[model samples]
Target: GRLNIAVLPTIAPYLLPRVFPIWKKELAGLEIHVSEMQTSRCLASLLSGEIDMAIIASKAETEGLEDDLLYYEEFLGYVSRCEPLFEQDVIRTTEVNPHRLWLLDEGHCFRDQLVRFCAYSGGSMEAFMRLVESGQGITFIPQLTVEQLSPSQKELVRPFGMPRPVREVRLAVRQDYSRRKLREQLIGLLRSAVPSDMHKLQTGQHL
Candidate 1:
């Protein structure tokens, strides 16, 4: 039997590619079907049995299922190195330019977080990225988000806050999830795929 997985877009862009190969390498016999969707839809799919488990960047309800905090992902500040936004080692949320801050449209938890954190609310990912590279403004995103970025694009990103603010990536599963044993395998693969600096588990936790 195979495991069906749905991941939030906020964590899917770079994470899916990284962990999928690990899932295949270590557990080639098991079939894994993965798809990307918004957090709300991912949770819905989990509840409806359309997907067996969901990888979400935010908290999930606890009464009906298991909500596991796999790891905390560090969010990096992407500011144009050419022109620059705030000239500091660590850029705070307040340092971000609300007018110039580009966001990843509606329905994304990351966008919502940016809106609440820095008051930047509106734009497609592609368009916002374009403006970010052109020195239009700054945007905060997960460290995994820029893995595929061009050399120039990579150069635009710099360290964000001191110690870097993080979002919790949780594994949401049914209370009586049949394939419970498989979760450890999946979680291990995912944690190992993350960059060392980006993997920040809670105190005294290693997973």
Candidate 2:
């Protein structure tokens, strides 16, 4: 059996590295093809049958598409040491300066969600991290992204205040597509890949 799955660019980096290896080894006879793309493209491809399934940061609102929750990932502040807010244990939305924030370009759902959540703001994930390290500005990143940071890099990470902003990561597929056993197996694998706490929303505001 073959499975074509597309994942959001923001999630692909941190998540696939952890899950793909396991999927490859555990599901011996299944062929899995993965693509990293923006949310819109993933939906479009799903509708057009260019891809069999998509893992996105938001629920699929498009008609004829069905989605299952994969996890809830909170957005954390990656503040530069130069910023005063960096000294705080938790960063507050009000304390964020839109002018100094670095954000992904337009068309990215990651940017769109934060723009609304922060009531103002605003990169490629990697480039923004480099900018933050240089003390240029601050950027919001997913919880999983934190696990990949080195000890020194982890020093830059900070959680947001209560009602933390989170994105609902989900497995999106067309309503008519039938791959019951495989889909369930994939879901099980995905849930196991992240921290148990992420399986449900906790003290977080869905963005």
Candidate 3:
């Protein structure tokens, strides 16, 4: 069985393994091939019956969406350990400033989240410049990135603000489609594998 699972480019490369344990087990019987698609393309594929399913951007299902909810993804920010913002436990809009922060450009929900978060009227580098130049402003990133940070415990680390940051990730399907058994399997896998609390996934609370 070939399984086509598309995901956001940034987070897709690093999904929590627990979420797909069963899907992996169930597909043990067939020659499973995994394909990664851009988030929008994945949704389009799902609706057109091109792929069986995908783990996509939760924001895609907005505007009074009518669909099954699969899961919510928690987000975190990733900054360079060498950056000046790392001096504290976390960074805010005030403490430090950078010439330019890294981002995936546009076409990302994270971009919109940042846009809303910074309250920018226009998607211009000027806003980012003003905020960051005034001092270091942080970008919200997906939670899967924490483990991948390199150079453990370096002196130069960027800080993140408390409450941290995150996004609401939901699993959605085509209207009037049925994948109940598959849905259940996915849900159970997430509950077991992705320990939300362990990874700063809480909606309002933080440790």
Best by lDDT: 2
**Segments of candidate 1 deviating more than 4 angstroms:** 81-86, 119-123, 201-207
164 Cα displacement, candidate 3 (Å): 2.3
Q: CA RMSD for every model?
A: 3.6, 2.4, 6.4
Per-residue alpha-carbon lDDT of candidate 3 for residues 1-207, written as tens digits (9 for 90 to 100): 344455555545556444456555754654444465666776777777766656565555634223444445545444444455556666674554434464445555666455455334324323432344344454445555545445551223343466554555555555544656655565455445554464334545332
- Model 2 stretches with alpha carbons more than 4 Å out: 119-122, 204-207
- Model 2 clash pairs are 103-123, 104-123
- Cα-based lDDT at residue 84, candidate 3: 56
List model 2 lDDT by residue over 1-207, tens digit each: 778988887899999999977886878887678888889888888889878888888879978999988988888999998988888999977987777877786657667688787722234688888888998788889888998888989988889898888888899899777777788888888989888988767655656
Tens-place lDDT digits, model 1, residues 22-72 = 777887787678887878787777778878888887778646767776777
- All candidates: TM-score: 0.82, 0.93, 0.67
Sorted on TM-score, best first, the list reads: 2, 1, 3
